[PDB]
Amino acid sequence: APKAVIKLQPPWVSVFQEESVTLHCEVPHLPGSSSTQWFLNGTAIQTSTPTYHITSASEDDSGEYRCQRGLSGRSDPIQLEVHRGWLLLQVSSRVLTEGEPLALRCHAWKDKLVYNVLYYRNGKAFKFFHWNSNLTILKTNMSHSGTYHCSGMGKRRYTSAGISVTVKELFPAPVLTALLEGTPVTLSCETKLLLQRPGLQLYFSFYMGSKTLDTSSEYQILTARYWCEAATEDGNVLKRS
Amino acid sequence: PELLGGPSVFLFPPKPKDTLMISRTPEVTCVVVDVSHEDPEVKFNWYVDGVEVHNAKTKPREEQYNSTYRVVSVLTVLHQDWLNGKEYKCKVSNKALPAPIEKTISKAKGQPREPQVYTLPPSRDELTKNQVSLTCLVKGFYPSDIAVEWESNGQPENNYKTTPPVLDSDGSFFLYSKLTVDKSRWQQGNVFSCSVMHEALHNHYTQKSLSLS
Amino acid sequence: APELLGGPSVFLFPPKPKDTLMISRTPEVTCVVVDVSHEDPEVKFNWYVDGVEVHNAKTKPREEQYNSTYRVVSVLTVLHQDWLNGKEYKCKVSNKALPAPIEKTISKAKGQPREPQVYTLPPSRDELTKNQVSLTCLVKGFYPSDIAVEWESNGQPENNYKTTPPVLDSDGSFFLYSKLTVDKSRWQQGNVFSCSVMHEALHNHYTQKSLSLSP
Ligand SMILES: *[C@@H]1O[C@H](CO[C@@H]2O[C@@H](C)[C@@H](O)[C@@H](O)[C@@H]2O)[C@@H](O[C@@H]2O[C@H](CO)[C@@H](O[C@@H]3O[C@H](CO[C@H]4O[C@H](CO)[C@@H](O)[C@H](O)[C@@H]4O[C@@H]4O[C@H](CO)[C@@H](O[C@@H]5O[C@H](CO)[C@H](O)[C@H](O)[C@H]5O)[C@H](O)[C@H]4NC(C)=O)[C@@H](O)[C@H](O[C@H]4O[C@H](CO)[C@@H](O)[C@H](O)[C@@H]4O[C@@H]4O[C@H](CO)[C@@H](O)[C@H](O)[C@H]4NC(C)=O)[C@@H]3O)[C@H](O)[C@H]2NC(C)=O)[C@H](O)[C@H]1NC(C)=O
Ligand SMILES: *[C@@H]1O[C@H](CO[C@@H]2O[C@@H](C)[C@@H](O)[C@@H](O)[C@@H]2O)[C@@H](O[C@@H]2O[C@H](CO)[C@@H](O[C@@H]3O[C@H](CO[C@H]4O[C@H](CO)[C@@H](O)[C@H](O)[C@@H]4O[C@@H]4O[C@H](CO)[C@@H](O)[C@H](O)[C@H]4NC(C)=O)[C@@H](O)[C@H](O[C@H]4O[C@H](CO)[C@@H](O)[C@H](O)[C@@H]4O[C@@H]4O[C@H](CO)[C@@H](O)[C@H](O)[C@H]4NC(C)=O)[C@@H]3O)[C@H](O)[C@H]2NC(C)=O)[C@H](O)[C@H]1NC(C)=O
């Protein structure tokens, strides 16, 4: 049976004290009337319903949540942090893979209003909004890794604490590994997986200028009388020679 | 409240030297910051004593390091217009502003008063050291727009510092300027001059010399 | 309406320079908290001299400003040698309109102290035509900018004077000028005027230079 999975509503892994968050333990094979085991830092929690609702978050709710229902595996952990501050940079996850969207929010304490908001990566503001607005980076790459924080104007200028986000690289960029006419031909592309991706596999292509030539991981003439392009099936992690 | 947000506007006076020499070009400068990429177009209207002028020069927007845009408009002003107290207004319009932003700048008001310039030689106690301090006392001037420079034998003196203007008892301003020169040059009788530029001075300047007896 | 995010603000001020150099006086650091709302008026102060908390601070009562806020001030007396050695003074403010206690820390300006040189400059030849005349005290080469300059004559304070702010000099030190205005009557009668300077790099923290007509 597959692993259990925790879902946050709202999805922000960082919340303010006295804020609300609901944790959903979802097992893909939907079960009927089985109990849910919830764990905070390895310690079981009294709640056994398939969702766990933190009504007024405190520092006692910070840590790693895991869950498990029926014959599923225990979920991968979710890390929740509870903070105080004027502003909080909320993210959906701290770790991601290239091509997975990253959502950011500059959350004001008690849902008050700030304006002229700045989003920072590694100390440098890269986005500005007259009115407070979330920000989503859809086609993420490893350059989006860094420490994110935000600032905005209330009665004064307020600034959030930083929080680091990692976008793991899926595979490096390609080149093509390689005379008398009438020619033996051996040729390959330049990359394979970096994460342990079990059910994923890359699609390669061979282009020159405008004249092109698929999942074919090896290119080869009949016997010989350019670019290798490496992109996932989704076509969201593109790398070229 | 409600509509809070959008760009800000700062309006800067011309440099005092630029208003006192007819060959220089005095300018008032209207700077708009916090311009977003989404609403990037900025419109300027300039007024002089309340009627619009159309000769300002507006530079294209420039991306700042904090991801925002900055746009600058420069209005050349007539020397006598600035000295005679005319009011320069910049009106900034942009769709991220629900009502244009207006800023107004002019010369400080009040009857102009002529500065008195006194050069003071180094104190005897300072003569025992490597470098000596020549001092230019400039007092009794209004407004605080002024410029002080040192010179000897037709060349500027590099090593001088001038205090900010200080408000005195009678409502006028004073300052001091300290020129640091090598004791050898001062004892070899080389003559040093302190030049003061101010609007209440005949020809907008006066110059006082100072050298060892 | 959804109110703008924000609450009180805090400012921590250092002792007056004259209080630091005279044991005759008591230097004090001052923690001022402004923009304190009527709805949440309670302010709590915690003082920490170099990490360890102290309790000799006394806080003034809440005083309302006409912009419909409160301004609470807490003053803490400090030791002379502690301030001049480099002790770090931390104010901690707590208020229910704050997400967390605000902390500010003040200390003496770091950097190698330099002794001030004091020179009295008599009036200029051309200023003697006026009947009100300028006596000048130049103080240069001092670090840090914390200094005190006064004028005396015949045991009495001469208060008709003004002193420029400290000015950053080319060699990284500071200088200033003090102008004392006296009637030309007093200058020509031969009275002796004195410029009194106080700075941590002075011996006994004090030096004075006097001035009068040469013949
Ligand atoms: C995003 O970034 C931008 C850009 O900033 C730059 O990039 C970022 C990433 C940072 O790295 C930043 O450090 C960089 O500088 C930010 O834009 C800034 O926004 C702030 C406000 O948030 C502005 O702050 C005001 O600054 C005024 C002084 O500005 C001058 O001085 C600073 C350095 O001190 C310079 O950096 C500026 O560029 C200004 O420099 C002047 O520029 C003039 C025009 O170019 C020059 O005059 C012209 O010179 C030319 C020669 O080149 C010709 O000769 C022309 O003839 C001549 O006209 C001038 O020489 C030059 N001076 C110097 C020294 O270089 C402050 O005056 C102002 O204070 C007023 O307003 C405050 C309210 O915000 C208030 O608290 C103050 O008390 C004061 O209020 C005044 O009070 C007095 C009473 O004393 C009243 O009488 C007045 O009426 C009242 N005025 C007003 C208007 O109410 C501000 O502090 C800052 O200038 C601006 N920088 C730039 C470069 O534009 C932006 O904020 C960032 N966004 C976010 C969200 O963070
Ligand atoms: C509601 O009203 C209150 C009451 O204000 C007063 O009451 C009414 C009648 C009004 O008319 C006000 O105009 C009036 O002032 C408001 O409270 C004020 O709040 C502002 C902040 O919004 C404070 O500004 C700070 O001021 C300090 C310096 O303040 C001294 O000097 C003032 C005169 O120049 C004087 O009025 C002050 O009281 C204070 O005076 C000192 O008082 C102590 C007594 O305890 C005494 O020991 C001192 O000797 C005495 N000094 C003098 C000279 O008299 C200033 O330093 C602050 O600037 C810092 O912060 C800014 C951002 O907040 C920033 O732009 C600056 O650059 C600066 O940042 C500092 O920069 C330096 C480098 O220059 C750096 O080294 C520092 O590390 C760095 N520090 C920080 C923290 O950033 C700031 O401008 C007023 O002082 C305060 N007034 C009073 C009386 O408390 C309130 O704001 C109002 N609310 C609203 C919404 O309007």
Residue numbers in the entry:
A (entry chain C): 19 to 196, 202 to 236, 240 to 251, 258 to 273
B (entry chain A): 232 to 444
C (entry chain B): 231 to 445
What does the paper say about this structure?
Among the known FcγRs, FcγRI is the only receptor with high affinity to bind selective subclasses of IgG in monomeric form (1–4).
Since Arg is the second abundant amino acid at the FG-loop position 174 and is observed in bovine and ovine FcγRI sequences, we generated a H174R mutant of human FcγRI. The three complex structures were nearly identical with root-mean-square (rms) deviations of 0.2-0.25 Å among them. The overall docking of FcγRI H174R variant receptor on Fc closely resembles those previously observed in which the D2 domain of FcγRI is wedged into the horseshoe opening of Fc to induce a conformational change in Fc from a symmetric to asymmetric dimer. All three structures crystallized at neutral pH with different salts contain well-defined electron densities at the interface between the receptor FG-loop and Fc. As the N-linked glycan on Asn 297 is conserved in all isotypes of IgG and the second GlcNAc is conserved in all N-linked glycans, the result shows a conserved FcγRI-glycan interaction with all IgG isotypes.
